[PDB]
Symmetry: D3
Subunit: 151 residues, 6 copies
């Protein structure tokens, strides 16, 4: 049995994140989205859940402390995340090698879909709160809350 | 059922490659090493086989044409390869997105072990043929053939 | 009066190139595509011409020697090209600074459209000639010739 | 009619910035320097104005909110900025593609002059306030204020 | 007579730092570790001293202000530091060229040992304080204090 | 006693190379320029010699095989080279770590002078042979031979 943990702050979750969730869900038996700010923990969870109803083998859970302890305790087998740029890679390479060193846990990376390469939660927030239309970059459950939260 | 294809020229296979094979073999049901020069096809195959006897769910096969056609025809589910540097990533990102575009096939990357980050088949060859000791960087089945081939 | 030269081998021209042509044509009075292999010079020209009929202020011309001499002789005012990655940038930065040094000619770069970030003429060719469908990445005038050329 | 907006914090403006202003002013009908800390808004403006008296088609203006809204409202046609490194490019590539997505506004980049590649406002400030001579990196109107401000 | 200054915050010093100290000590007559937070200045000094007893030509000293003023005042001849990634290089390249500009002081870089490429003081701290075993990445004098400090 | 070897093809030597020679010569007792095409070996040597008459502790020598064997045999203590970009660094990092692995020989890097960051022997040649004035980028002994060689 295999299991991928996808860790992050998801504040908020983007269509880029969901694309990675979908791609991890097709290769692993279970996916756990581990949520480690604009939105509360509770809202971040609902946003992820409402955006992933089409993924029966995925669940969302709050995480505390080292991602590797989360992986080992819950019997998962790998960490999975997306990479957009060579700069993403150098940063994530450090964390992955450190995680391999301390716990023997492997990290698998997948390349962003080209259409979401420029998306970050932080940029989407900064733009959305200034009137920019980032609706095509985020799941509708997130768009709802941004519209409300900003009215 | 899941399956990872690890494609490359493997001329020759290195301990870095084997590390990736091992890590793919722990997450996927089968691994196929697809061999796409210093050594003949036949020798490259034996070198890979002799270096992976400890991996029962791995097999070696010659590949022709697009890696994605190999993946789809044989019912495999993903391409897996290692990345050493941000420059590896930018090059492999192009191929991965192109492969996703033409065939819907996903590529999962894993970070090199730190001790092999500077290893390439080409550099190992150029150095070995000049008297440099690269034996700690390559499997013993490869070292044997380099010693012979160079006597 | 302003003029941008867009230099390259265009073997063949891609939808990524055309996107840059369009964006240069909106800021400059004239655009000259300077064509500096799979296709003949004559075919490369027709492919560019047939792909740019919607750009009245753009023309195609064969180029020989330094791009800066082409710019100065024909009274153009800048070189314009696209960038996909940080690695594109470092290479093109060298040429741009050298061109500024020898001739005082400035180069303006524009970021690729995200959907074409992984496109190169060379990769498109290698894939197309192996049966891969790259038709969505190239103008129809190019697709025609690839289909013919490969039948 | 064409117009380039050059946005930034300009705290303070450097000779690198001025070089880009000059190069934008030669290709566009108007340039607007949009000023979006060590110096007040008022001082930043004077410093830019006093450093650009030789550019009749350039004006300085305070900016609020999205740069793209500034461009569209004032009938400008492009954003123009400098790039020093591949790392500058990856960061600015994200903003440029986001700006293209939300507003259709294009960004043109120009490579730094080699002599200013290591210049940043932040590094110049940190060094100047410690006695280092950064006078050759900044316009005299800025040097005046640094000398005063630091006496 | 030659002298290398190795500047940094060393909070705490790592085995990666010590490797660089050793390599600088073999090429220069003297090495000065200049200490410019988790640990006090006093503790940082002891940790460096206790970790370098095997280097008779190395001494540790607190630094204030520009590293170049430290180098010139004490008659040293160069700054020496390690680089892990291309991103380290671009950042350190800026500081090195600025230091050359203001004071004529040269900086020599050495590549990290592969086994420490993923090590940073900040990552080691964050992990150690969460129960992760980073003991193989740090000198025993540092490990002692982390164990104490965290009991 | 210390000694730096500066290895390369020097076809031809540039002002960027000479800047590095000068900076190595100020920190090491001897510098050996090891010459490992447009110009003959004999001419490359004369060009380097004529360009370095102001460096009494520098000599030029032809090199064969591994640079590390050259260093060890002649009792030198380090390899020294310049770096222009993060991409230079990633490539040279591989060679440096391989050289450390096989022979224990360390490599020290120095950052290019900003004014020569875009200079390469290959680009200078391609441009010079097309009429471009690269004379300010190369030593006069090289300029002489390019003028002759191209008349
Ligand atoms: O960094 C962000 O805020 C942010 C928001 N969306 N995307 C994204 C954009 C395009 C594609 C995939 C995501 C981002 O890029 C960071 C990717 C790093 C990452 C960390 N944890 C993850 C878990 C799942 C997937 C990715 C990650
Ligand atoms: O490029 C090479 O010649 C070469 C030789 N060994 N290693 C290596 C060094 C360290 C770690 C993993 C490999 C290399 O790096 C390239 C990694 C790209 C790659 C392409 N196909 C693959 C299949 C399996 C694993 C990796 C790849
Ligand atoms: O390098 C290639 O073969 C190739 C084919 N298509 N694209 C592309 C992909 C996405 C976006 C814009 C182009 C490529 O990327 C290289 C971009 C460098 C460039 C040089 N000359 C140019 C003239 C106009 C536009 C770009 C360039
Ligand atoms: O980042 C800085 O503080 C800073 C100060 N000077 N220079 C500079 C150094 C060399 C060359 C051109 C500028 C900097 O580099 C950042 C370049 C990004 C940029 C953003 N907005 C701009 C508007 C006009 C021009 C550039 C920019
Ligand atoms: O950045 C850190 O916190 C940190 C902790 N250990 N290492 C390291 C990891 C591997 C190898 C050499 C160091 C780090 O990498 C930063 C290297 C930059 C550097 C600045 N000053 C220095 C003085 C001596 C040596 C290096 C530096
Ligand atoms: O690569 C080239 O052809 C080339 C020509 N000049 N410069 C240069 C440009 C700016 C600054 C220092 C050199 C080049 O950059 C490559 C630098 C790599 C290098 C290898 N061996 C060396 C020996 C001494 C110094 C450098 C090197």
């Amino acid at each position: 049995m295999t299991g991928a943990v996808c860790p992050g702050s998801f504040d908020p979750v983007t269509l880029g994140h969901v694309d990675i969730f979908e791609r991890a869900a097709a290769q692993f038996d279970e996916v756990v989205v581990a949520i480690l700010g604009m939105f509360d923990l509770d809202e971040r969870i609902a946003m992820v859940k409402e955006s992933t109803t089409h993924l029966p083998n995925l669940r969302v859970q709050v995480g505390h402390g080292l991602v590797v302890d989360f992986v080992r305790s819950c019997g998962m087998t790998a960490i999975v995340k997306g990479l957009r740029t060579g700069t993403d890679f150098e940063y994530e390479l450090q964390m992955a090698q450190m995680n391999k060193h301390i716990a023997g846990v492997d990290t698998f990376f997948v390349a962003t879909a080209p259409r979401y390469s420029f998306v970050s939660s932080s940029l989407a927030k900064e733009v959305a709160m200034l009137g920019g239309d980032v609706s095509e970059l985020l799941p509708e459950p997130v768009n709802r809350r941004l519209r409300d939260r900003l009215n």
